[PDB]
With several copies, the nearest count.
Chain A
Amino acid sequence: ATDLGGLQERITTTTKGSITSVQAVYVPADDLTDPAPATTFAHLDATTVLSRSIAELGIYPAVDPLDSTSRMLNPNVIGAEHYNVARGVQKVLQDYKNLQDIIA
C-alpha cells in the first residue's frame, strides 16, 4: 500500500499544471478482491471496471455499468439531466440482473 501510494500521490493536478492519468489495472484471476487492485481502487477518481461476462456477450467495450463508478457522478457536477439518466440506466440494468436468474 505504501509503494502504490507513493507512486499514485505524485500523479496530481497541482496549482502549476495538471496530469490526467489513465491507468490500466490487471486483476489476477478476474478477482477484484486481490490486494493489488483493491489497494489501487482508493486512488482513482473514476474506476472503469471491465468484466469477462460482458466480453463473452460480445458487448465491446466490456465496461461493467454497475461496477464502474466515478466521482463525477454527482448531479451538482454533471447536471441533473445527465445524472438521472445515468442512474435510471443503472437501475434498469440492475433489476434486469435480478430478473435474469428467473429468465434462465
Chain B
Amino acid sequence: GRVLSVGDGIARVYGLKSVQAGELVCFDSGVKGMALNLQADHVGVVVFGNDSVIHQGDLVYRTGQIVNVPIGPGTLGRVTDGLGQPIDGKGPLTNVRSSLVEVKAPGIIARQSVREPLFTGVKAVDALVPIGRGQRELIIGDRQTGKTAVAIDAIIHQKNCNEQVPKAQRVYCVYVAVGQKRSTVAQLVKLFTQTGAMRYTIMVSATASDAAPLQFLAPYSGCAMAEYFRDTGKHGLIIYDDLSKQSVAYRQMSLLLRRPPGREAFPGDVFYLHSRLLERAAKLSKELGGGSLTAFPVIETQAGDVSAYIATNVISITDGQIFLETELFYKGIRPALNVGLSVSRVGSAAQFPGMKQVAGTLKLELAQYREVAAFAQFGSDLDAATQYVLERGARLTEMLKQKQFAPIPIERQTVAVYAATKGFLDKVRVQDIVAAEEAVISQVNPAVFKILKANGKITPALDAHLKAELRKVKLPGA
C-alpha cells in the first residue's frame, strides 16, 4: 500500500485491498500500524509510534495478522509497553506465546457465580465494600485521592497471600499504566521490587509520550496478558489505571480518523470501548477451569463530578464502586472512602465469613453516624444516645484509617473491627484509636489469628476466647 497522506499519527493508505479491520500493518520505516477504518478509497491507519518517519508515497505492507501480544508466564516480572514489547532492558520475553488483544468475553454458560473473596488488605474496602474473585470494581475519585494507593495495596497484598495459600489459589496481578509519567511507573517497579510483588506482577506501561493507539490498546494488551491466568485455571487481578486516560487516547484517534464527535468530543462507541474490556473480567465455570480475573478500572473525576461521560459509563459497567473523596482525604480519613456512596454488588456473597458477621454491624452504625453529624455540627442539642452514635461512629471512622503500603491480612482486620464493634474501643480517646489498634494486634496472641484464618469464621469457641484476649491488652489513653 502507498501512503497517501500522513500527519497527527494517522496515515491514509492507498491500496491494501485485502487488509482486515483491526489488522496490524507495517510501514517501510519499521513503525507499525493498525488498519482501523477501511474506506472505499483509502485505509485509515493509526500509527504505533512517531509518524515523523512516514512520508507520502511510503510503502505499507500488511502483516496478515490482527493485533496480538505475547501472553504466558514469561510476562511475569517484566515491564512491557502497550503491545507486549518489554521496556525494562531485560532482553526478550522467554517462555511466552502470542494471542489476540481483542478476544470475545466469556458468555453466560462459561461463568459461575463470584464466591471466593479477593482480599485487598485495605480494611475500608475489605469490610464495607468487599470484592470477590471475578468482580470488576471501579476505583473512582478526584485528582489526588488515594486511587492508585488502593490498587497498589491490592497488588502488594496478593504477594503476602501467595506465600500462604496453596499454588492453585494464587492471584497474579497485572498493572496497566495508561497515560502516566514514565518515572511514575518507574517508582512502581521500584516499589514492587523491594516489596517482592514483582514476582507475580506484569506491568503494561503506555506512558504519556507513547502514541495514542498505544495507550488505547494497552488495557486490551494487559487484559490479554491477564486472561492467560483466567483461561488456565489460575486467578488474575488486572488494574487499569486511568481508563479515563485511555478514552482520551481513543478520542484522539477517533477525531483524527474523522469519526464524528459526540459527548464532550467522545466517539459514540466509547461505552463499547470499556464494556468490551471490563466484561473480560470473569469468574469462569469449573468446566473451563474455575479461573478468574478481577478488574479494577480507575476513573478520575474533575470536581467530584461523577456525572461525566466516561465516569457514568464505567459506573454502569462495573459491579461495585470505590468512591474516594478529596474532602474526606484531608480530614485524616485515608483511604478516603465515601462509605455512603461506595457499593459492592457482589456484597455479602464473597466476603470473609469472619468479617461478614462483624462488618454488617459496622455499616449499620456508620449509616447512623452520617446524618447525626450533619445536625450536630450546627451545635443545637445532643441526646445521650445521639451522643452515642456520633461518638461510636468516630471510633469506627478512625478504625478504618490505614497507612500507605501496609496491607493488613484479613484476620488482623476482622479482629480490629471486632474490638471496635464489640465495645472494646469505647472510652479510648479518638486521637489514638489509630494508635491503640497496633496493641490490639500485637498484644493479642498471634495464635488466635491462625484459628480465624483456618476457620474463616468466628466460632462460638473463639469469640469467648478472643474477647477474653481483648481484655488483657494495655490500651493508650484509656
Contact = CB atoms under 8 A, between A and B. Distances in A.
Task: Determine whether A and B are in direct contact in the complex, meaning some CB atoms lie less than 8 angstroms apart.
Answer: yes
Interface of A: 1-2, 4-6, 8-10, 12-13, 26, 28-29, 31-33, 38, 41-43, 45, 47, 56-58, 66, 69, 71, 87, 90-91, 93-95, 98, 104
Contacts of B306: 29
Contacts of A28: 307, 312, 316
30 contacts: A1-B249, A1-B252, A2-B9, A2-B212, A2-B252, A5-B207, A5-B209, A6-B208, A9-B208, A12-B181, A12-B183, A29-B312, A32-B303, A33-B303, A41-B143, A42-B208, A42-B242, A42-B245, A43-B181, A45-B183, A56-B340, A56-B341, A56-B367, A57-B367, A69-B144, A90-B330, A91-B330, A95-B331, A98-B331, A104-B375
B179 interface: yes
A71 B316 contact: no
B209 A33 contact: no
Nearest to B334: A87
B44 to A, nearest CB: 17
Contact of A2 (B144, B211, B341): B211
A9 to B, nearest CB: 4
Given A5-B208, A5-B209, A43-B208, A71 B182 contact: no
Contacts of A8: 181, 208
B331 A91 contact: yes
Contacts of B341: 56
Nearest to B340: A56
B302 interface: yes
Contacts of B245: 1, 42
Contacts of B143: 38, 41-42
B305 interface: yes
Interface string B287-318: 00000000000001011011100001000100
B144 A71 contact: yes
Interface in B367-388: 367, 374-375
Chain B contact patch, size range: 35 or more
Nearest to B367: A58
B302 A33 contact: yes
Contacts of A98: 331
Interface string B11-35: 0000000000000000000000000
| Residue with the highest number of chain A CB atoms closer than 10 Å, among B330, B332, B341 | B330
A38 B330 contact: no
| Residue with the highest number of chain A CB atoms closer than 10 Å, among B9, B209, B249 | B209
Contact of A94 (B209, B302, B331): B331
A9 B307 contact: no
B160 interface: no
Contacts of A95: 331
Contact of B179 (A5, A32, A87): A5
B364 to A, nearest CB: 8
B180 interface: yes
B248 interface: yes
Nearest to A29: B307
A104 B374 contact: yes
Contacts of A6: 208-209
Contacts of B144: 41, 47, 69, 71
A12 B367 contact: no
B208 A1 contact: yes
Contact of A13 (B183, B209, B307): B183
A1 B248 contact: yes
Contacts of A13: 183
Nearest to B305: A33
Nearest to B341: A56
Interface in B321-369: 327, 330-332, 340-341, 367
B156 to A, nearest CB: 14
Nearest to A56: B340
Nearest to B251: A1
Contacts of B211: 2
Contacts of B331: 91, 94-95, 98
| Residue with the highest number of chain A CB atoms closer than 10 Å, among B208, B211, B312 | B208
A70 to B, nearest CB: 9
B252 to A, nearest CB: 6
B361 to A, nearest CB: 13
Nearest to B307: A29
A48 to B, nearest CB: 12
Given A2-B212, A9-B182, A12-B181, 16 more contacts: A1-B179, A5-B208, A8-B208, A9-B207, A13-B183, A29-B306, A31-B307, A33-B303, A33-B305, A38-B302, A47-B144, A56-B367, A71-B144, A71-B187, A94-B330, A98-B331
B62 to A, nearest CB: 26
Interface string B212-226: 100000000000000
B107 to A, nearest CB: 21
